[PDB]
Nucleic acid binder design. Sequence first.
RNA 1: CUUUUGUAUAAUGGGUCAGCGACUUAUAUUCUGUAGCAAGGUUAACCGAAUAGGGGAGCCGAAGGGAAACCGAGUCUUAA
RNA 2: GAGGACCGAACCGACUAAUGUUGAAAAAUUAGCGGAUGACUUGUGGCUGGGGGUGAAAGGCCAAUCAAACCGGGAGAUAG
RNA 3: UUAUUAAAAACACAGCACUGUGCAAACACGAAAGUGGACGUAUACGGUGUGACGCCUGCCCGGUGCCGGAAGGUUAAUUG
RNA 4: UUCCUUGUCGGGUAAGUUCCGACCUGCACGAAUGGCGUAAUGAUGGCCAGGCUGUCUCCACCCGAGACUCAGUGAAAUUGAACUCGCUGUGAAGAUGCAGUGUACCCGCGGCAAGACGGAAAGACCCCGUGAACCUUUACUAUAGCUUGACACUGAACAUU
RNA 5: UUUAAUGUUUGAUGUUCUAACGUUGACCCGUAAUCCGGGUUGCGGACAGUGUCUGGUGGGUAGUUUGACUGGGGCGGUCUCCUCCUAAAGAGUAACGGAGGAGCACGAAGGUUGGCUAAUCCUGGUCGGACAUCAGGAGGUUAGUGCAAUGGCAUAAGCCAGCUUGACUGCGAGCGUGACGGCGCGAGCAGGUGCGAAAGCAGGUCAUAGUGAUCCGGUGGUUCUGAAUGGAAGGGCCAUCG
Lengths: 96, 76, 51, 64
Amino acid sequence: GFEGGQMPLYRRLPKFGFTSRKAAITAEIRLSDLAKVEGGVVDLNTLKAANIIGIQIEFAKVILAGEVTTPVTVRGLRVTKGARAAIEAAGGKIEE
Amino acid sequence: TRNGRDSEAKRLGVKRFGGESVLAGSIIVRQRGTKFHAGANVGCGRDHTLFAKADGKVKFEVKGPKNRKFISIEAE
Amino acid sequence: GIREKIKLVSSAGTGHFYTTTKNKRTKPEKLELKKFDPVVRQHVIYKEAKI
Amino acid sequence: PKIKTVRGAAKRFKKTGKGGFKHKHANLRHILTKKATKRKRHLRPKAMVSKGDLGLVIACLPYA
RNA sequence: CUUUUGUAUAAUGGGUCAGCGACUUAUAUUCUGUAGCAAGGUUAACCGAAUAGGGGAGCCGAAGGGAAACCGAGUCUUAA
RNA sequence: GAGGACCGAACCGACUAAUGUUGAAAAAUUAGCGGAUGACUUGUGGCUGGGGGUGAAAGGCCAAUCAAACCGGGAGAUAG
RNA sequence: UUAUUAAAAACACAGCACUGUGCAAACACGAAAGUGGACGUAUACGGUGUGACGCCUGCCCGGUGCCGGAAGGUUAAUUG
RNA sequence: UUCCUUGUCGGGUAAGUUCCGACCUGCACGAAUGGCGUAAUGAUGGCCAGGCUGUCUCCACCCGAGACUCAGUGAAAUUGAACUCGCUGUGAAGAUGCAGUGUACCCGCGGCAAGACGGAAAGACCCCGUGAACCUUUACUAUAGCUUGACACUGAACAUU
RNA sequence: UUUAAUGUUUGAUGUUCUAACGUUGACCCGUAAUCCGGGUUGCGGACAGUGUCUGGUGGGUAGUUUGACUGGGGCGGUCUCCUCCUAAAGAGUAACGGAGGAGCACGAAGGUUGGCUAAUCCUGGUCGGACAUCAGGAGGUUAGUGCAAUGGCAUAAGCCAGCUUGACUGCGAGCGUGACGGCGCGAGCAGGUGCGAAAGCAGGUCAUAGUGAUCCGGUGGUUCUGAAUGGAAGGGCCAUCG
Ligand SMILES: CC[C@H]1OC(=O)[C@H](C)[C@@H](O[C@H]2C[C@@](C)(OC)[C@@H](O)[C@H](C)O2)[C@H](C)[C@@H](O[C@@H]2O[C@H](C)C[C@H](N(C)C)[C@H]2O)[C@](C)(O)C[C@@H](C)[C@@H]2N[C@@H](COCCOC)O[C@H]([C@H]2C)[C@]1(C)O
């Protein structure tokens, strides 16, 4: 970063933002990961057992990424409106 | 007393010459006064920058009873 | 270097304000203008206050 | 030993999707009454690091 | 030979010979080549008549946007 | 028979000149020179130690070493 | 007196002056104990400047320092 | 101590930027960081005179120790390599080495120092380095020491209020 | 209504006192000892002295700083910005080259609608003059522009009046200019507003100088965050200040 004495780029620009401690305990789950789970019903514990999310994850969200083919019961997870349609299209069920 | 001062050059002058095709908003000429005047489809900025208000080819003309130079956009 | 910086506070409840300069020696009277308040999205009157 | 991040750079640059870096604009901390609103408005959104400066940023943020 | 705009230079260095004498190592990181596997890839410590096998704790990747909550193939900006 | 008295050897010193300057000698020799009962000189032993000593003071001297000794260590200090 | 290019008009000096110091002295060396000053006691001791002797040593207390003053202003920890 | 300056005048000399005496126009003396005198003293500074002389005019001879030759022993600095001339020109701008030209048989010995930008010591001058050291101060920041107060070690009685 | 004086808390001091403490006073013992300790006594005495805290002083000592450009260095001058020339008819272009300026001003000197057109001189005319105001002619911008220069300006960008706050908020096609940080121009869109009958014009000022990154911190706001949870502190975001 030394530029010969001129105020370097990372010092003449302002600092911004802050780091959220909740983002470190939140994960995203692809539709293609719903088949890797064991038992069909997916929750925090079953996703951790399947080594899909970290052990310290407290909040998990399923997004429209990949593709789901089997009926899956999502429980206690936030689901995007795009993934909600794809899960219900494969005979799945979403319950809060 | 002592000289040795000057200011930075301002890069004035014509940016798009006659016949050039320009997009809407393209700066045509930067100038201090209105050495060139706005014609058809050409605006005059607050610093008398002439910019194209429509696409087409720029055109220089001398018109009026004072023989003033005008810049217009032949919309094409 | 005489003009002091002032702020014009909106008469509406919102804390929105503009900032401008003023020569308080020649113009001791408070400045009042109708300016757009982006919080209520209306043109209300703005009164002077200290920066 | 691991490379150490320049922590000052980590607080000013965020890595974007295609590998670029976004950053906040300068000239928007203090005296602002004299600045035109149009000028201040164009400084609010984040900007991308120019091509000439990517070498400096990448060297300072090896784990970004 | 070096150093220089420029050296037969009266600029530097060497009396000669023989031996020795200067871009290495470790760990990270990025890129290129090459090999394996491939939406996956790979294990670390450790266990182990141990270069095998076990060990998937982890790490990287398959999703991003936003300061963030959050939303999510979109998201942020804004009353829009 | 007084004297930091006089002349002048030993003794202590070092003013001038020459020589020497890879010397006889990392400070001398030769010829002259100053003090020579005193704030004199000398032997033996002791004490003061490094930002410290000692200095009738020249930054002098402190083992051929001094505007901060020597030896070992930090140490392969750093050297645009 | 500059050991080893300077011996001098430099340093010292007797004398002079100022100033500090009442003795567990000032002061100095010491984290301290203590020691020197001194087994001394203001006709003494320390510091500073001047430098035998002779004739002398004028004006300025605004600045800086030192000494004295204590009314007032300002002002630390503390207190809350 | 005086820049102007070899000030001016006087003395000394045939001739004196020094010296001595005076003048005052003290660039920029001055009274204990002392002023002005001062006998004696000084390997102290300046100047003059007598004596004396190879200091000199201007060197000559002589006596010794080297130098020189023979025998014995036997160094040193330095050194890119050398078959290592003059001149004029040229050229990193002062040439043994380039150009042109002149001169010159091969090799010693005794001498002399004009050149080899001769030898010696990575210029002490000068500049530079966001080098060093030590020194100074009303540079900055600290700090030993000195000093102020509060609290503690630290109590009683009583006035004064 | 008021006044005095005995009783109390805290101070404000002082004159006594002795019992802490001091004693480098005397005497005794350890002890055949000018150390030290104990004892007796005297004299001081809550002072002195020491610890923690604190103000002052502090080249006694220590660590350091003490710029660059530069026809060598120093001295002098200069260091950012604007205008002209050098600059070779696009842009750009150096010198301790030649000349000048800026570190602001203005709620009108901004917006809009309506109107208006100078300098100078001549002639005539109370005080009145070379120069005041009046009238006419000439003249044609030689004037004016908040300020340097340059380029502009009559449709005036110059001058006057009315009404006003667009010196708006969110944005922004597309360009210009920079190594970059940046800087500049901008039609149009949304919201709301001013002037005008209306077409329209207005996102400051004829244009180009009037300026300072980041950090740290302040103030206001904020359907952001809140280290068990609910809050809060702090942080973020927006506006703004040093
Ligand atoms: C007695 C012999 C010593 O040399 C001398 O004394 C010389 C006279 C000495 O010079 C004297 C006398 C002087 C006048 O130069 C003639 C004076 O300028 C110089 C600085 O000092 C040499 C030339 C003197 O050399 C001159 O140095 C100056 C600085 C530059 C001269 N020249 C390059 C122009 C150069 O000739 C040196 C530096 O003294 C020589 C040096 C190589 C050696 N060191 C010196 C040590 O003593 C002197 C102290 O030094 C710190 O001793 C030298 C060398 C070994 C000798 C040769 O031993």
